[PDB]
Amino acid sequence: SETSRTAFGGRRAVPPNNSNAAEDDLPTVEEFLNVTSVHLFKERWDTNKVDHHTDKYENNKLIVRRGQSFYVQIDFSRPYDPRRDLFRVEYVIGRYPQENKGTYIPVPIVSELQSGKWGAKIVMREDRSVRLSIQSSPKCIVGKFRMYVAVWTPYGVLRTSRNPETDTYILFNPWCEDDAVYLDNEKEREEYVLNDIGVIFYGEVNDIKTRSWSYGQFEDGILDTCLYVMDRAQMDLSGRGNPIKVSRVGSAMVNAKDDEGVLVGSWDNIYAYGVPPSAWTGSVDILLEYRSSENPVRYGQCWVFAGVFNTFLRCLGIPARIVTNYFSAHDNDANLQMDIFLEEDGNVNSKLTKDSVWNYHCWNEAWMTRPDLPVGFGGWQAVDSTPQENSDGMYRCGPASVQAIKHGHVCFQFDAPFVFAEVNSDLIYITAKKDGTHVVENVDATHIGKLIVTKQIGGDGMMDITDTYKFQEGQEEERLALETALMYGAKKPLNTSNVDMDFEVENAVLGKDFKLSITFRNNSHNRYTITAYLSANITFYTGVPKAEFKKETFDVTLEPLSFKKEAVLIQAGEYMGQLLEQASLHFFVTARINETRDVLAKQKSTVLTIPEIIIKVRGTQVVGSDMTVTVQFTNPLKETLRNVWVHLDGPGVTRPMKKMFREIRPNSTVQWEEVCRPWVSGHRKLIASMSSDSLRHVYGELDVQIQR
Amino acid sequence: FGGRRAVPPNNSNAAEDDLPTVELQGVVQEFLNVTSVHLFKERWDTNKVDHHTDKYENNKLIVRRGQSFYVQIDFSRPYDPRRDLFRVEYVIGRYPQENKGTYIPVPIVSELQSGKWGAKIVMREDRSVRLSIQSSPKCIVGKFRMYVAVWTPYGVLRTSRNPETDTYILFNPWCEDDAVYLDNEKEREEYVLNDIGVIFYGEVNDIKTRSWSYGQFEDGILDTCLYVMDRAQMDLSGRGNPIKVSRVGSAMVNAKDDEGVLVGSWDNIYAYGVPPSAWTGSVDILLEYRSSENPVRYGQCWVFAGVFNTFLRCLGIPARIVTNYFSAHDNDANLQMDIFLEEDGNVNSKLTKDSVWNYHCWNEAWMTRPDLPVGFGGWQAVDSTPQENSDGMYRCGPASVQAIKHGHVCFQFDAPFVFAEVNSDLIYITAKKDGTHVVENVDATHIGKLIVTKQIGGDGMMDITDTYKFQEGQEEERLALETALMYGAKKPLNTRSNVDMDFEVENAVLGKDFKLSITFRNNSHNRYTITAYLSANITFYTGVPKAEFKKETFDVTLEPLSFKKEAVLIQAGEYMGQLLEQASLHFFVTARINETRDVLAKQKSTVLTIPEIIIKVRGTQVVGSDMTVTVQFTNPLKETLRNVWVHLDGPGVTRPMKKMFREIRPNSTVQWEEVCRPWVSGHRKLIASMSSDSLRHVYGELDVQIQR
Ligand SMILES: [Ca+2]
Ligand SMILES: [Ca+2]
Incomplete structure (x- = not known):
């Protein structure tokens, strides 16, 4: 050294562009056309949002999906003349936008749109108005962008000033066939992207249970919270157009570590300073409380993490569904044996037998190609936001190709040996002898990952997807998959009238x-x-x-x-x-x-x-109209249930609401009437839960048909 | 209640449980009492000499996995193979369990068995028995507690807690069954036993060198490396996997918030800590981390690499530091680095915002890769300097160097990123007045043009460019590029007179x-x-x-x-x-x-x-005798230097120390003399640096023979 002074920025010439919320000020100056007004045709009944399948969001800004054309109009000071005028729309995102990072996007005026490229085609010139059909790249960054018009002159560039009214969200696009997230089934698209109401499967394999969940991805504030989640991860704006990285990062934010992600995990049954996991009724109040408080929300467990993550994926546009695995070997460390130790008399040794299988465990599946992998591995990708020990630490696992898991090809990222062991492990019954030696007695290969389900496309029914993770026990394909897996990460540490x-x-x-x-x-x-x-x-x-x-x-x-x-x-x-x-x-x-x-x-x-909780309705069931909903719980137990919080939800019908009854004495009923005013029409759903000082994991719902 | 798991994670070596000294059960006593235990753990004796652990400044027993060592148990009366059953126990963590590898009962066996824990009685004499104990070559690496346990019919009797018999078990490069096996003595010596390195810096036409103390055998370093893992909360069952130790350890090197060893900084000022240029080795960094329990300020890539290289060779993983000249860091797996050119041909510095590093250091750690197809074992690249990877802003690797060389970059971990770091092209692009961009030419031979590391048995540079990349412009290189581009490498722009x-x-x-x-x-x-x-x-x-x-x-x-x-x-x-x-x-x-x-x-x-600094010595150069070191620095510049800190170092010769000179005038010399008493004999080095408020990145060294 030998100095010119002041701290220097030596690690990089431009700071990371890792927040959608931050922004730069673009110069308005860097006879000639001048922009007098811009029209985005963004009303929810209009062509763009209807054709881009974005009419559901409770949001008054334009929202489109990438890889697909949308219409804008620019009014100028005088007519546009191709003999002397040069102008282009720009879209810009973050505080440090850069064309080569994909975050400053000059859209060129072209004679015809090209598959795969950004481009704006002049489809109409009327008086001083030009109508453009703007196509975005199908690999574009997903986020909220700033729109500008720039006019190129001999002396430099003039530009419109900041205008919040034209800010445009661009989302993933399951309808666009060149988008990584292409899903070629309309019915699947409605269920896995546009349905905002889910069912969770719980209970046990021989007594399945079924509860309803508000994803609420279209509700007010949710889309903005999903961007906020990525900002709190400091996610590089340049990776937000990759559905793999989006799922990898966003899932890592679901479970809160310290005071950093969205939900504090706790299975302690008491939940002193938060709200039991069982009480939640959907992702909406959780996500909005995260964004509002800017701190982890207390508390969640696997279906809660999965509920929220499912909201994150759907809202951004990646098709997503929640899966329930029955008899789940979590915390596997990629071993395929779970040990039960017996005494010489044949009793279970409860001192040694310390590994448990989950009666059920929920995670997520997100649809995308896997261009990073050999062909054949795209489609559903398992993502489990409930952490366990993987190659890196105590973290989320995935995305892992379900097909790759099904075939044992668990060398392909991410964390596939872990999700493979979650559904393919064996029970091993071992005698711990009084001399301290151990003897293997038999092995149970049919308990773990016995049945794996997800909500059906049609309705509230259960679909069985066991065969998608695994081949039939006994046959060649299942044997080939285990043999491969054992080469690439899976372990079997003990060797097996x-x-x-x-x-x-x-x-x-x-x-x-x-x-x-x-x-x-x-x-x-x-x-x-x-x-x-x-x-x-x-x-x-x-x-x-x-x-x-x-x-x-x-x-x-x-x-x-x-x-x-x-x-x-x-x-x-x-x-x-x-x-x-x-x-x-x-x-x-x-x-x-x-x-x-x-x-x-x-x-x-x-x-x-x-x-169950009983829900009923009277009054007219009309969007913009008052209906009255009654929330009913009859305690059938001999304790007096204390601090009995009741929670009501249902997306497009009400925000999430809760009520407490100081006590419900044996066999009495409580009732809570709420006047709601639906904002969404069609087949909807009222949703309720109750948790008391003791008894909880109580659900109810009601299907309602809403007119308008 | 802990409903998340039956037993908490066993993820700290410092934590410990008490084993019962009497853990009886049943109905209802002189079965054999140990009176003392001897570990033959002196630094001149055969255990440490044959395990290559005698250099550690550490009075406990330290052995390497998969190899025998001898111990002696003196009982209250003669061991009696007719009636007695007993065993050595090794236990680690607060929650040890046999099926996780953290409770290890060692069975007395008739002959040792390859790959298994066992102990052979090799001598009986009076009340004493001598054992030869073999640890599994897959054993967890850590500091274990040692017990002896006697079986009765009712359960066991057991020695009590005794710190003096706590035994370190490390990775074993001399064991043919260890994952870290390195088949020759000259490489073992260099990459494991050599505690002084050389760091290559400067620029490809002008290679500079300076020395670095690894100091992995200095007092407190071993325990610090275990404390590093404990601050990572690394599961103890992962600490015998050199792939996971590399993966977790390197992630601990760069501090994020108040976690990790070194806060990175490239600002040229370094207010409130120590300039990255001023460190002479790893030792005072790691010991400061440990005593404050907080990140140390400050580091840059060679410093991260120096500390990581210590951590590796200290636990027994062979390791070296490589320097790559013209490094494309922060590549995003893009193989294209842009220069923007004005229309007249001048560089456009407003748009040209990506920079090639003159040099960049990382580490290579030697192990098998049984998670990967055959052939990818050997050197694994691990760069603890962060950049954006699939997951976020983190360290990269281990990435098999052979997989990088052939373009097989789907194989974990972060291989596309290390690939692009050595293989990117310079793309010169004209940015026209009208907003469009024109590709002019591509320079495929600037990035990664030289990769080097210290020679075996000297301070000279080994060119290892060939280990990362085939010959430019030949079939093998072309295949490797093609393979890479289908499994994570990217090339966003499609490419005389x-x-x-x-x-x-x-x-x-x-x-x-x-x-x-x-x-x-x-x-x-x-x-x-x-x-x-x-x-x-x-x-x-x-x-x-x-x-x-x-x-x-x-x-x-x-x-x-x-x-x-x-x-x-x-x-x-x-x-x-x-x-x-x-x-x-x-x-x-x-x-x-x-x-x-x-x-x-x-x-x-x-x-x-x-x-360069001047270092001189006088006096007897003999272990345990005083010698006087003289370190001189002449200010060559014509400015005055302020707050000149000089550091002295030399594993086995002196701890790291520094002395400040308030100002040094033009062409004026300061003198520091230190009386050192060497504790290590043979060829040693004294190492010096100087950092001031202006001038820094100033080094010296002197080689010294210390006599026994
Ligand atoms: Ca099975
Ligand atoms: Ca090249």
């Missing part, structure tokens, strides 16, 4: 008793004497066990060629003080055969069916 | 005049007229320009089939008083051919050669 045991557990209403029966088939011609053990645990929906509420031992003598069934009754009083939110229960039935020391082992989950 | 141009710039001492000479080759039969421009910028080493200090333009007439030279004089006074630290200059020579409108363009950088 005539008695069948199973068991069935009755589904019941919360507070009711239920039956369980155990069944033995001895096909052999020999006699067996078995000691079988029943262990029945309160658990979170994650599988995490809180308490053994019921233990039992059966002594069985098996005759040759026999079938033997054994029945027991669990009373309500054996679990009723003890249940966690979601009310799930987990059963082990494990048995050692005395003659052979063979292990038979089986597990099953159950949830108690919890009470 | 027989005149050639190049130029040369004399290298000069700071304060001296120097010449530049431009030559034009007319290979045609035509006579041409040219206007040529020369713009000479004061830059940072990253290529970010601060000011144009010189600007000639001139007319040339080229005769057919001929040369014409044009020489330019640059006098000292034209740059002096405007330089930035590293005293980098950059030169453009652009020329427009009048007759054809063709463009010639070329660029060069030089650096002024800056004054």
Whole structure:
């Protein structure tokens, strides 16, 4: 050194352009045409928004989709004359726009539009007006841009001044066939992009449950919040036109780390200083509270993270759906074995058995090509915003090609070995001997990833998409996929009579008793004497066990060629003080055969069916018209439920609202009437939840038809 | 309640649980009591010598995985193979579990077994038994706690907590079954055991070198590298994977907010910390990080690389620092770097905003890549200086250098970005008055033209350009580019009159005049007229320009089939008083051919050669005896220097220290003498730097033989 003074900007000549909200001031000066006014034909009934499928947003600015032409008109001081005039529209985004970064976009006047390029074609010249058909690149950056008109002269460039009224959002475009996010099915487009109401699947594989969720991607403020989310990630504006990077970054913002992303994750069941995850009714109040407070919102769990992320994708224009995997091996570290340790007597060792499978776990799928991959891997891409340990740390996983997962090609980014293990792991039943050695007893290859579902395109029904992640157990394709996976990230760390045991557990209403029966088939011609053990645990929906509420031992003598069934009754009083939110229960039935020391082992989950909220309506059901909605909850339980928060939602019918009733005494009903004034017409939906100081994960809804 | 998981993440080596000394169970006592344990852990003895761990300034036992070491257990009476069952235990974290690798029961075995933990009784004598214990070559790397446990029928008895037997287990380059296996002694010595490096800087025509203390064996460094992982909350089950250690560790090197080791800064001022130029090695950086528990100010790429290289060789991963001359950093995986040209042929500096780095340093870490197809093991590139990648602004790699060389850039991690860093082209583009842009020419040979690293057994430079890229303009290179462009590499713009141009710039001492000479080759039969421009910028080493200090333009007439030279004089006074630290200059020579409108363009950088420090020594140069070091610096400049900090360093010879001189007048010398008592014998180095309020990037060194 040897100095000229003042701090220098030596790392880069221009600061990162990583915020849509920030802006520069473009010079208005850098006889000649002069712009007197601009018309974007942006009313929601007009051609541009209707043809660009953007008429739903509650937003009065123009919003179009990339890769597709839209119409503008510029009025000038005198008629435009091609013999001496040169002008172009410009679109500009961020504080440091640059043409080579895609963030300063001069749109050239062309004779004909070209596939793939930005261009504006003069389709009409009338008096002093010119009408343009403007096409954007199908790879354009997605965000809110500033529009300008520039007039080129001999002395330099004159430009219009800043005008917020012409700010134009450009979004991804599932209808545009050259856009990465091209989805060639109108019906799929409506469901995965334009439907603002979802269903989540929960409960357990043998007692599926179904709750409704407001994505609300068209509601006021939501689109702007999705841009804000990217700004808070400091996402480079130049990567916001890549649906892969968009999904990679935005998903990383869903779970809050410190005081940085959108939702604080918590499964502690009490939720002191926030709002239970179970209470949420959709993404709207969460996203708006994030943007409003500028801090993480408390609190979420996997379906909440998935609800919000699904809103983010849909709103920006990437087709997205929520998936529910039944028996989910999360926190896998890419191992394909989950260990259950037994004692020598055949009891579960609860000291060692510490890995749990989730009764269900939700994540996201986002549709896009994968031009970075060998051909064949585009389509749905699994993205799970609920973090687990991957190659980098405790983070989100994905985007991972579902097809690549299905084929074992888990070397292709991102985090595919982790999502592969989430649905393909085996249960391994291991005896931990009293000398400290370990012996493998048998392996259960059919429990994890048993069924995988998502909402149907038609209606509220369940679609089964198990076969999209995995081939059929037993056949060549499934074997080829495991063999490949084991080469590229999947691990199997442990290397891997005539008695069948199973068991069935009755589904019941919360507070009711239920039956369980155990069944033995001895096909052999020999006699067996078995000691079988029943262990029945309160658990979170994650599988995490809180308490053994019921233990039992059966002594069985098996005759040759026999079938033997054994029945027991669990009373309500054996679990009723003890249940966690979601009310799930987990059963082990494990048995050692005395003659052979063979292990038979089986597990099953159950949830108690919890009470629904009743919703009803009267009055006329008309956009711009008052209807009255009644929210009804009848406590059927003998505690007095305390601080009973009730939440009402339904996109286009009401914003999200909540009410608390200080207590609901045994068997009483509360009611809460709200006058709503729908703003969206057609088949809509009122949505409610309740959480009290104890009892929660209570839902209700009502379908309503709205006229206008 | 923790419903997210049954046991918290085991992600800190500093955390620990208590093992029960008696963990009985059952019905209802002299089974064998250990009276003491001996680890033969002295630095002259065979465990540390044969494990190559005897250089660590650390009185605990330190071994390398997958290799045997000896221990002695003295019992209260003679071990008795008839009736006794016992085992060594190794345990790490607060939540150790056997199936995660963090509780490790070591079985007494009849013979050691390759790839498995075991201990052989190799001696019995009086009450003492001697063991040979082999760790798995996949073992977690960390500081373990050691227990001995005795099985009774009722459960176990166990030694109590004893810090003196805490055992470090590191990666093992000498073990043929370790992922980090490096098959020869000369490379092991250099990339693992050598604690002094050389850093290559300057510019491709003028390679500068300076020494850097890795200091991986100095007191406290090993524990610091484990504390780095603990501040990353790195799962303990990932710390035996050298791919994940590299991936997580390098992410910790650049500080983001108040997390990470070094705050990056390129502002030439460095208020409130220490100039990146002033560090002499890693040791005081890492120890300051550890004691303050906060980021250290400040670093730039070679400093990040120096500290990362320490972290790697300290845990046992072979590692070296590479310098790439003309580096395209912040590439976004684009292979095209733009220069914008006015219509007359001058550079448009308003639009030209991307800069090539004169040099850029990163690291290579040696390991297998079993996550990748075969052939991609070996050197992996890891650049802890951030740029935009698939995820955000982060470190890049590890990326297999072989995968980069062949263009297979779909294979993790961040390979497209490292690929573009060495393979980008310069694209000269005219930006016309009417807003349109015209491509003139592409220079495919400026970026990545030389990549270098320290030689084995000397301070000389090894050219390793060939490890990253095939021969220019030949089939292998062309395939590799084609492959790259289909798996993440991008080339956004689609790409003579027989005149050639190049130029040369004399290298000069700071304060001296120097010449530049431009030559034009007319290979045609035509006579041409040219206007040529020369713009000479004061830059940072990253290529970010601060000011144009010189600007000639001139007319040339080229005769057919001929040369014409044009020489330019640059006098000292034209740059002096405007330089930035590293005293980098950059030169453009652009020329427009009048007759054809063709463009010639070329660029060069030089650096002024800056004054070396003088280091002298006297006295006995013997381990444990005093010697006097003399460090002198003469201010060569004609200005006065203010707040001159001089640093002294030399692993095994002295800790890092510094001394400030308030001012040094023109051509005046300051003198620092330090009494050092060396703790390491053999060929050593003393290393010095100087940084002032102006002048910095000033170094010296002296090699010294220290006698046993
Ligand atoms: Ca399976
Ligand atoms: Ca090249």
